[PDB]
Amino acid sequence: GLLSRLRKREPISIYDKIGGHEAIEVVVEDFYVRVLADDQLSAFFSGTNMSRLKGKQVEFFAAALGGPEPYTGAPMKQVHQGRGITMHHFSLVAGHLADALTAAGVPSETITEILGVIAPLAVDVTSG
Ligand code: HEM
Ligand SMILES: [C-]#N
């Protein structure tokens, strides 16, 4: 936990500094509200079990930012490949993530840091 890691002189992770698991859960919920209300994106998730996705994304986002959480989903390249996702789509999704972070009160500097961890994933997520 954060306390245990601090007693062992480990640096504070992005996960811990934005409020850990509960912060990620709040942000992911908001994020998908934003994504599904965007006409340019909603169709990608037609028929997708959103309850299930949100759970995987909470795990994935937590793990990526330094949480202890198990990621239980499939690899990014295999999940997204062939879905006709372009950098324009990727960027919109990253935009909604930034907007959810802002709405949750995450300092802009830390959102930029989070996008620096996420942006590289575009190589696996896009086909365009
Ligand atoms: C920004 C970086 C992204 C991350 C970290 C991410 C993460 C994830 C995760 C964890 C899953 C769940 C995989 C599983 O079920 O095992 C997933 C699935 C999915 N993602 Fe993404 N994603 C990203 C970008 C995008 C974009 C840009 C789109 C479309 C514009 C997209 C559309 C989808 C779809 C359609 C699924 C599968 C839902 C289903 O199985 O029906 N993702 N993604
Ligand atoms: C992908 N959400």
Side-chain angles (χ1 to χ4, degrees), residues 47-118:
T48 277
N49 185 331
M50 296 300 315
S51 163
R52 189 188 164 273
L53 175 51
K54 294 199 238 182
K56 297 315 185 207
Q57 189 68 271
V58 165
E59 295 157 8
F60 185 84
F61 205 38
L65 296 183
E69 341 245 5
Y71 169 59
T72 76
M76 297 295 92
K77 185 156 197 225
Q78 157 192 318
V79 159
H80 294 102
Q81 67 183 342
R83 286 180 187 277
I85 301 161
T86 70
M87 187 59 10
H88 158 68
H89 299 126
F90 183 90
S91 295
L92 289 184
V93 163
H96 292 312
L97 179 60
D99 290 336
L101 289 161
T102 298
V106 184
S108 59
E109 300 89 336
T110 299
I111 300 181
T112 293
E113 198 185 357
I114 290 173
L115 291 165
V117 171
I118 287 307

